[PDB]
């Protein structure tokens with residue numbers, strides 16, 4: 001039922017600055033906050049979001065994650081002169097205090113809870129809070145690393161207390177380790193913390209052994225703290241995505257969180273003087289989009305770091321773009337992760353394998369267009385449409401006399417005539433985005449759709465098809481890759497066929513969609529995705545599938561549904577229109593026959609498609 005997307009911001013949080021000379025903190029300036037809002041203003045996104053107002057956080061909300069002794073210590077800072085403030089900040093590591101910092105810290109906190117209420121009250125689908133100071137480094141009784149109060153921690157405790165939540169996912173994609181978040185929920189299994197961060201074998205700030213993949217949680221919460229330590233700088237987009245596909249996304253879907261909260265730090269981006277990574281701002285449109293099908297979209301993004309005033313604004317806009325459902329930009333040049341990345345991904349997978357057994361190994365403004373059958377009318381969301389013109393049918397009959405001399409079924413040449421002009425509408429006219437047509441028979445509809453697609457032009461076409469038997473698709477020339485889910489052996493590299501027989505069919509389809517299907521497709525970088533579903537059901541996953549694949553081809557997907565299914569066609573096109581995606585509940589474990597099936601496919605393909613690799617290669 002939820003609709004919009006909240007943007008909480010207030011220029012008041014830019015009214016505090018570092019005063020004395022301090023090389024540690026000089027990177028943390030008020031312009032971080034104004035540059036990123038005026039960047040949202042320029043690109044026309046800030047205006048597109050419900051502007052929830054900032055509030056102060058009550059002292060009983062602050063005591064949720066801090067001690068009265070440290071609350072009172074901070075509470076006295078507004079009365080101090082700079083002789084007294086630079087003495088109070090020396091008591092902590094890499095943090096500075098201002099006359100207004102306590103006031104703004106309460107705003108940064110309350111602005112987060114404002115966002116939590118907005119999302120959880122179904123008032124908005126998701127949202128982001130542009131706040132200052134950051135949060136993830138502050139602890140129960142200490143300010144640390146530009147942070148005063150742990151904003152993201154408040155949101156989790158707050159949503160737990162005031163909404164009776166059992167499963168919250170915190171994703172900290174800032175490039176520093178949020179130790180205050182890990183400390184807070186260390187023994188807590190209801191808040192699943194994930195943090196990737198620049199480690200350099202403990203050489204980088206905050207220089208903690210708890211930031212390592214060693215630490216997984218104390219007591220009854222063990223397995224709900226996940227640290228991915230980057231041990232070398234210069235991480236590429238492929239490094240960030242392989243981390244999602246192979247540790248974060250598999251854990252998040254079998255965790256099935258009821259609310260996703262993000263520590264959005266953009267010092268993890270290229271050009272940041274502190275992160276020294278190489279991920280482009282576009283990657284955050286995908287890190288955001290890959291997380292949308294969790295918690296039915298209820299996602300609360302909260303700003304942390306990001307210190308290149310140029311590179312900061314660009315990545316903030318890529319994030320809000322995907323929150324509003326705008327098409328995610330294609331990512332080219334993707335490949336295998338770097339060797340150290342594969343090292344730490346392999347290490348963290350192993351330690352956590354005793355808690356998530358999906359990690360075990362054998363010992364060694366119109367968006368969508370629908371075309372239902374004629375005479376069928378249906379109720380559709382506010383970004384959909386229906387059907388042919390003279391110049392379209394001219395080619396449709398041309399195609400007939402050349403390749404289909406013996407086919408006179410007026411139902412099917414309406415199948416093909418629509419297929420052509422929806423593709424003409426998607427690629428050529430650039431008006432509509434996605435599409436779904438219900439076709440009569442496939443051998444003619446699939447062949448017609450694919451061949452007309454390459455001449456749009458479509459440099460590369462990813463084809464996802466569920467059902468048994470081969471199709472009329474030539475997969476040899478390298479301009480088309482085929483994913484098939486059926487009930488068969490495999491030979492060439494540009495294909496991938498899966499057969500899972502079962503009650504865990506929805507659990508295996510996910511562990512194979514994140515483990516295999518997504519990493520291939522992202523490296524493949526198509527211009528168009530072609531979905532095909534034959535009449536031969538089990539649709540708990542199609543919504544998630546049809547949603548996560550739209551990270552490719554800049555969203556442009558066409559679906560061929562054979563045989564009208566009221567509840568199926570309703571499921572596909574709402575995933576295409578961008579609606580919230582229904583959770584699966586917690587994902588159970590797949591069968592050993594099916595995971596042994598999967599690793600046989602990974603090792604068979606990971607040489608051409610390096611994004612499949614989740615362990616570092618054994619040199620010959």
Ligand SMILES: NCCCNCCCCCS
Nearest residue numbers: 024094145146176205305
């Ligand atoms: N060059 C000195 C930086 C000290 N480390 C501060 C950590 C700030 C991260 C907040 S996201």
Ligand SMILES: [K+]
Nearest residue numbers: 172174176196
């Ligand atoms: K982090």
Ligand SMILES: [K+]
Nearest residue numbers: 185191224225
């Ligand atoms: K935890």
Ligand SMILES: [Zn+2]
Nearest residue numbers: 174175176305
């Ligand atoms: Zn940071």
